[model samples]
Target: AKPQPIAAANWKCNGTTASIEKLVQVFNEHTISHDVQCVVAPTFVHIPLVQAKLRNPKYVISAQNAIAKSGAFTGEVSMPILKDIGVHWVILGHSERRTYYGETDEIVAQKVSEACKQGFMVIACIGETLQQREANQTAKVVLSQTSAIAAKLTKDAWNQVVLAYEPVWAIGTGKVATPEQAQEVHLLLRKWVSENIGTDVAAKLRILYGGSVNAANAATLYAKPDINGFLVGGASLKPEFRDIIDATR
Candidate 1:
């Protein structure tokens, strides 16, 4: 049997603990018919609390970010700590981190390597800004980001990674890519993986779409061949996040 496609909602820094519990309750009440895997990435402060409140094992929990494997990082969350707390997945190279924290491709790659070494699965994010997309360098930009990590990843590491293609233009701007636009990038990402990694691995990997993914267009995007699932933002904080999960079903 084929591996089930997975969907993860990244709440980013939004939502209080009480609100997250409410969202989780709403998601648990909804019945999902599809064989898609579902996960939620909440803020760091709520990882353990939310994990404790998660009643369904099928609905997994993920960390929004984790620090590189090193001591004295001060403000960063270590991989060892995340593993100890039962965080199965981590989001690395998110646009916000790259833009806000000045994280480069090399830094993101190191983080991925460290996370995998510590036995944490990763939702690796990559994307082009509106300028890059408009300049027709979207593929180039994405490949550059992927290649940085590919150079560092081993075959075993690939198994624990899921790529989330989130265009900068679409993220939190109330703008969304047309299905064709989103699929084109997803297909390209798969092809890049085939060429850089191997055909067999590419086939097994799940490539997800993000940026402005909401219930209104969840089904349309989910139907795409290369789009395994989503890395939702705003909608993830509300009960509507469950609606997006139901769409996958």
Candidate 2:
């Protein structure tokens, strides 16, 4: 059987007191299917409010980013801090952080490794840029990124992870990979994991398709064999997110 389907909302760098109330209200009013796992990652400041307003125990709260250790890293959030507020999931290796904020594969790997050690789940992102994809380096780039993470992780840590393949070219651009296009990568990544990470890990891992994942494309994309869920961006903030969540059915 496929792993439990997940529909994650990544409210990255956006949301306000009023906007959060509306989003949380919409999410709270609806009933999520029993089997599908739903997660919401609001901005750090908004996590407490969202968590408090959310009525469904199934709606897990995640942090958009965090450092491996908690300390004098002035502005960085840490695993201990997240746990203090009941946030258990963290999004690492996001393209915006990689491209603009300069988080290298090693940095992301460190965060994933430590998050797992600290007993937290992670939504680890990996992808190729438009230029890299154009050069036919998609597999190489993505696998190398995953390899870096695999290098840092132990066998058990894989269980705490849900991978997100958000091609840099597709994110926030309104252009998404066709179901087939996305499936091809998911399949390739799974196969790579089987050989390198472990056959069982590959079979059990939930690889989500992020980037431009809205209601319109969700059903078709989720229908693919290897795509177990999503890490949504733009659409996740709107009421349409409910449609994306329901697509798992």
Candidate 3:
């Protein structure tokens, strides 16, 4: 069966109290379909606040990142607490978290392990850097990332799991993938999932594109059959995000 569209926003480190309130208010004004999944992730401090103001039933909240454990991790927020507070999904292994924050594949996989164990959905990100892409090592690098997580996952963990392909160089550099480039990786990823998991899971799984997706390019990108949706960064905070979501529908 073809799945409903997933339009997610990762606010990264941006947003203020006043700014988030306005964005949520504006979004609530729209009449989006309940079947279309709309998720928004704000900075850690704002999850509760954002959830309170986003009134549409079609919309929900996600965490930018979450610690895999349950307690006493100092700055890390646990998945249990996020679930208790109504966060339906969490984004792990985003390029920013991996590249700048020094998260290894093992650590990202650990987060995925924990999230799936709790039956919460996870947006597990995987991709290659510019140098790796230039070396034509994209498939090799992406497979490594996926396998690292697969080794730790139970067969059932494929439930509630969505993959995001965010080319490191494309992210925040105002460089987006060509639809051909995005489709190539997405097709490869679906095939990989089929090999490692099962064909049934692969067919139902949603693989999203991340990187410099904007209103201008979203329609074209989402038009690709393999590109299920997007994991938006900078553009998610702007008014044009509405257009990007519409592009999917």
> Largest TM-score belongs to which candidate?
2
**What residue runs in model 2 are displaced by over 4 Å at the alpha carbon?**
none
Clashes in predicted model 1:
0
lDDT of 1: 0.86
Candidate 3 TM-score versus the reference = 0.96
* lDDT (10s digit) by residue, model 2, range 1-249: 788888999998898899999989999988876588899999988888987898875688899999877889988888999988788899998999998999999999998999999999899999999999999999999999999999999988999999999999899998999999899999999999999889899989999999899999999999999999899999999999999998887
Worst 10-residue lDDT window, candidate 2? 50-59
Best by lDDT: 2
Alpha carbon lDDT at 70, candidate 2: 80
TM-score of each: 0.96, 0.98, 0.96
RMSD of candidate 2 to the truth, in angstroms, is 0.9
Q: Where is model 1 more than 4 Å wrong at Cα?
A: 1-3
Give model 1 RMSD, 1 decimal.
Answer: 1.4
Q: In candidate 3, residue 242 scores what lDDT?
A: 84
Question: What's the lDDT of the predicted structure labeled candidate 3?
Answer: 0.89
Alpha carbon deviation, residue 224, candidate 1 (Å): 1.3
